[PDB]
């Protein structure tokens, strides 16, 4: 008796599982398209060298990885950003900005902890848009999918905020900018931990209390204004965020979005704007995270600087909150037609209707074994067939076959069957 | 500068590869849903102990395998139809036959010829059904795929025969069971090595001359009759032929099929009929393969034997054909609006008639950086937009945008657009 289960931490998709998978995979792929966004892929398996940031993430603590018995170190993608900017600078100038590439990939990651090693991560960026109408088209995007499952503006939110008010903080407080993406990474973790053991955190990494609390005063304020006495309305980050709330107001979604001084992700190369997908009722972790990385690209060896921003949005928190406000209800199996012989004489003729119901575009099974027509109809019933034709000898040398609607059963000639 | 190259033998799918790939999985999945099978997937990633099956297979030869940190072996699939057993017997009686499962899954080889290292199978199976009806689906399946992608019969053909043929030479002659999945293996490289190397191959394995050339006889047999000669119509593999043929003559795929002697496939566990997608013009290798393993299940420690059959139909050969005949041209992206702003004034605008094309199930993008007008049209060109919609000032106030078909431009009040 062979292992049933599944390998640690993954997931198998059985027929019923995999029509909620779709379900969902459907709503990403048809935001996309409603937004313009072109579908992209590229191999699940990674050369290591394209993740080690040395910025201390959680991302690259935990990554898959292994060797290839040719020596090379390669890794199962733990996310699909740089795989990104590794096609975008292979196209090198035959790349036509502005773009806008989407992907649902399955990304992976390792733990100790025997927690899921991998879920489905739709991606989408937009590379080559200077201006923050590409985060308002992001954010927008992420509610659109949102909406789209059947949640409202009164269940979940998106919540905004900009690295680069953190940034002159860092900056003025006299911190050389590598130690800038370190920081974000300590306190993107803020409410997780205590806040003894993040100043601690921070001053492991050559902060004295003064620089340690101008940081933490900046995540606590509350409004754009508050930001703005802190660092004028001069600054760029504060008409960004103003452009970016008045466009994303102007579409239609203002009620979805709202500005959050805490907000600064986990990841290293976000540069500007980022956001956060939450619940409203508090109940679950983050739905989708994204914002805006101008230099990973350079940082790739990209002979010019190329910005970009995009998000990614997991599928294991959306089911969660999906399931929770009982907008999932298992869908069950559905068919056209099922085609029932009267009995093995009558299969050739059966054969031919079901060719002519798939012909039409119709789905179509016909009973595969010997089986009784009272069995065949059971089985119809279980496969969610809407329609029985039972092909039998009587009918057939008239020219017709008898259809029962299963949401008598009359005799019907051949050609008024499609 | 970093690798932009993929890994080893692996492809990456920027948007135009990708809407090639597309065009062909939507033909798999529709072929699926014409025929009424349910899609399934599982695990990239299996358990090693899951693939070695001793029968010498050029599969088990060449896997993708490696060591988890944590201890365990496990392997990037080569092939799915482990993995589907081994969700058939999670299901256990809780499994409804016959049950018509399938999938897209990429699949992983290692080799030191560095030959692609992945590739996308289409599988199809059918599970739970005894009669070579099952077989039939499955074949016509195949066919309707490759209609669908524009092929015809004069292009393509599938050949069928029956491992039962040789089960019963082999075991006539007198050798044990055990030696014949092997020989099946053997048998199989048969065209693409010589005949003195097979048989040379063959005798490794314990077998005398005698019993070596009745195989070799077999194999060469042309028709069903030869076949009958040599084993009667009384035998079973005769009768499941006839009938094959007979229903998918029946259901209206004569032409497609033929029977062919030679065919064995190279999998282990086929026990029954086998078939093999072919080019007519003898220029590729095969387009896909199939057959009935009534055992596997058996092996894999279920309590009662099941019955299964199915194909593999992989994306690098049937690309290859198509791309001869000239049937996968370029599709070029599109989208159905593209809102152009007059000016950064007319944004807001802009954006909400962004807001209504969306809501109306067009897809539509939006100029996101400032550009003049005639670069915006440009853009709109090179994105494949069927309608630019210019939004001035002047217009606005009227309560009109203005509209140009790109396969003037008028002038049409905002609810006329949708
Ligand atoms: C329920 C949340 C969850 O499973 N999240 C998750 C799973 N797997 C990966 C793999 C790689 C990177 C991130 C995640 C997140
Ligand atoms: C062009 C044919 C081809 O690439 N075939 C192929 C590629 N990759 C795998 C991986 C695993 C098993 C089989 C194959 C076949
Ligand atoms: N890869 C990021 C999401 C992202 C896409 N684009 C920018 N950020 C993540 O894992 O959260
Ligand atoms: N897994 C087989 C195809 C198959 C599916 N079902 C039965 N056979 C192959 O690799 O060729």
């Known amino acids: 008796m062979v292992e049933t289960e599944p390998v640690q931490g993954c997931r198998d998709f059985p027929p ?47 990554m898959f990885n292994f060797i290839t018995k040719g020596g090379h170190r390669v890794a199962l993608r733990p996310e699909m950003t740089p795989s990104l900017a590794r096609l975008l600078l ?41 201006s923050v109408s590409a985060e ?42 590598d130690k800038f993406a370190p920081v974000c990474v300590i306190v993107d973790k803020m409410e997780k ?5 993040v100043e601690a955190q921070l001053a492991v990494l050559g902060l004295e209390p003064t620089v340690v609390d101008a940081i933490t005063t900046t995540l606590s304020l509350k409004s754009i204004d508050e930001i703005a006495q802190r660092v004028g309305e001069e600054h760029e980050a ?24 805490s907000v600064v992700r986990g990841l290293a190369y976000y540069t500007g704007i980022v956001f956060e997908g939450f619940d409203r009722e508090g109940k679950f972790r983050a739905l989708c995270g994204g914002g805006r990385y101008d230099n990973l690209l350079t940082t790739y060896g990209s002979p010019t600087p190329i910005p970009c921003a995009g998000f990614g949005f997991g599928d294991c ?22 085609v029932i012989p009267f009995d093995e004489s009558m299969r050739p003729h059966a054969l031919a209707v079901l060719r002519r119901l798939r012909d039409a575009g119709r789905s179509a099974d016909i009973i595969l074994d010997k089986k009784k027509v009272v069995q065949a109809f059971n089985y119809a019933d279980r ?36």
């Open 16 to 62: 019923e599982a995999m029509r909620c998978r779709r379900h969902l995979f459907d709503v990403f792929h048809a935001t996309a398209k409603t937004f313009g966004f072109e579908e992209y892929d590229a191999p699940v398996l990674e050369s290591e060298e394209l993740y080690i940031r040395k910025a201390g993430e959680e991302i690259t603590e935990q």
């Open 238 to 261: 504060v008409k960004e965020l103003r452009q970016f709330f008045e466009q994303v107001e102007a579409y239609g979604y203002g009620d979805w979005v709202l500005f959050d001084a």
């Open 90 to 130: 292979g196209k090198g100038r035959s790349l036509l900005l502005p773009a806008k590439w989407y992907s649902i990939p399955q990304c992976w990651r390792y733990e100790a902890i025997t927690r899921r090693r991998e879920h489905y991560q739709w991606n989408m960026d937009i590379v080559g848009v200077k």
């Open 193 to 197: 931990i205590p806040r003894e053991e």
């Open 317 to 338: 928190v959306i089911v969660e909150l999906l399931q929770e406000k009982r907008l999932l209800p298992d869908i069950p199996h559905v068919v056209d037609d099922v």
């Open 136 to 177: 308002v088209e992001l954010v927008c995007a992420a509610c659109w999918a949102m909406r789209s499952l059947g949640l409202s503006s009164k269940d979940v939110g998106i919540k905004v905020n900009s690295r680069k008010v953190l940034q002159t903080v860092v900056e003025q407080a006299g911190v050389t900018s």
């Open 383 to 418: 496969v969610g067939a809407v329609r029985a034709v039972l092909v039998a000898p009587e009918e057939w040398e008239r020219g017709e076959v008898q259809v029962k609607m299963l949401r008598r059963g009359f005799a019907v000639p051949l050609d008024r069957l499609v």
